[PDB]
From a paper:
Extracellular matrix binding protein (Embp) and its subdomains referred to as the F-repeat and the FG-repeat are critical for adherence of S. epidermidis to surface-immobilized Fn. Embp is a giant 1-MDa surface protein consisting of 10,203 amino acids (aa). High-resolution structure analysis of F- and FG-repeats revealed that both repeats are composed of two tightly connected triple α-helix bundles, exhibiting an elongated but rather rigid structural organization in solution. Both F- and FG-repeat possess Fn-binding capacity via interactions with type III subdomain FN12, involving residues within the C and F β-sheet.
A high-resolution crystal structure was obtained for the first F-repeat (corresponding to aa 2569 to 2738 of the full-length Embp). The F-repeat consists of two three-helix bundles and reveals an elongated shape approximately 70 Å in length and 30 Å in width and height. The N-terminal bundle is referred to as F-3H-N, and the C-terminal bundle as F-3H-C. Within F-3H-N, the first helix α1 (aa 2571 to 2584) and the second helix α2 (aa 2599 to 2623) are connected by an extended loop (aa 2585 to 2598). This loop (referred to as the Sandwich-loop [S-loop]) is involved in several stabilizing hydrogen bonds and van der Waals interactions between F-3H-N, a linear linker L2 and F-3H-C, potentially important for the structural integrity of the F-repeat as a compact unit. The analysis of the F-repeat surface characteristics reveals a prominent deep major groove as key structural feature. The wide groove shows an area of approximately 1,200 Å2 comprising a volume of 890 Å3 and is flanked by helix α2 (from F-3H-N) and helices α4, α5, and α6 (from F-3H-C). Compared to the FG-repeat, the crystal structure of the F-repeat reveals some similarities but also significant differences. Most importantly, the F-repeat misses a common long central helix, being relevant for structural integrity of the FG-repeat. Within the F-repeat, however, cohesion between α-helical bundles is supported by a so-called Sandwich-loop, a structural feature not described before. Based on the high-resolution structure, it appears that the F-repeat part of Embp is likely to be less tight and rigid than the FG-repeat containing region.
Numbering used by the authors: 6 to 108, 120 to 173
The structure:
């Protein structure tokens, strides 16, 4: 039997869904939907892994596992659809700075320094977790990069 489509669909279940530049509320919604779907996803992953590892798998077993994987992928895509892009505030930042010059930054700096320290602690926890998923690693990377961007901006005004 040709397992190509099942293998490819099974691998797609593990792909990172990017949270880069997504709103914090929409990320919460995504994580909440993924948790609701998690047992269905895990069962699809497990059944597909068994078929993939079956040396003499049948087309029926491949097709049944593929159907489960496709339904699990639809659940992931439903969760992904909750993610929303942040809106760009760069022109508002520049306008605010121009108004300030025409006429609390320390607290804001300290808040963003703390956010950077928390991002480093979160990254270390993920790095040290041998069970970490591609999604968890990528989420932590995006959090680190956002904390760096926010820190530089807060120390620069």
């Amino acid at each position: 039997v040709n397992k190509t489509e099942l293998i490819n669909a099974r691998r797609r279940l593990d792909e990172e869904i990017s949270k880069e530049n997504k709103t914090p509320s929409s990320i919460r919604n995504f994580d909440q939907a993924m948790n609701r779907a998690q047992s269905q996803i895990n069962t699809a992953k497990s059944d597909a892994d068994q078929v993939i590892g079956t040396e003499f798998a049948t087309p029926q077993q491949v097709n049944s596992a593929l159907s489960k994987v496709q339904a699990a992928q639809n659940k992931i895509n439903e969760a992904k659809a909750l993610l929303q892009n942040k809106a760009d505030n760069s022109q508002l930042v520049r306008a605010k700075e121009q108004l300030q010059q025409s006429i609390d930054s320390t607290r804001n700096y300290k808040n963003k320094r703390q956010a950077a320290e928390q991002a480093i602690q979160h990254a270390n926890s993920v790095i040290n977790n041998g069970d970490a998923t591609s999604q968890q690693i990528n989420d932590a990377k995006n959090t680190v990069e956002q904390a760096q961007r926010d820190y530089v901006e807060a120390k620069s005004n």
